[PDB]
Amino acid sequence: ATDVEARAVQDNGESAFRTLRLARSEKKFRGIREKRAREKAEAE
Partner 1 sequence: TVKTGIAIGLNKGKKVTSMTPAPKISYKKGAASNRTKFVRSLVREIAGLSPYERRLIDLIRNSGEKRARKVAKKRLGSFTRAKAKVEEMNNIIAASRRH
Partner 2 sequence: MSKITSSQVREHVKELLKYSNETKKRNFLETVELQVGLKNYDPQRDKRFSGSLKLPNCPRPNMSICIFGDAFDVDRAKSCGVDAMSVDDLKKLNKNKKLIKKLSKKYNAFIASEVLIKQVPRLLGPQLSKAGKFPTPVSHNDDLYGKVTDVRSTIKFQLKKVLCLAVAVGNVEMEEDVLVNQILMSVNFFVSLLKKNWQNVGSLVVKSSMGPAFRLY
Residues 23-42 that bind partner 2 (CB under 8 A): 41-42
Q: Give the nearer residue to partner 2 in terms of CB position, either 21 or 35.
A: 35
Q: Calculate the CA 22 to chain-centre distance.
A: 5
Question: What string of DSSP letters covers the chain?
Answer: --S-S----------SHHHHHHHHHHHHTHHHHHHHHHHHH---
Of the pair 16, 41, the CB lying nearest partner 2 is at: 41
CB of 1 to partner 1, least distance (A): 15
Give the residues lining the site for partner 2 (CB under 8 A): 41-42, 44
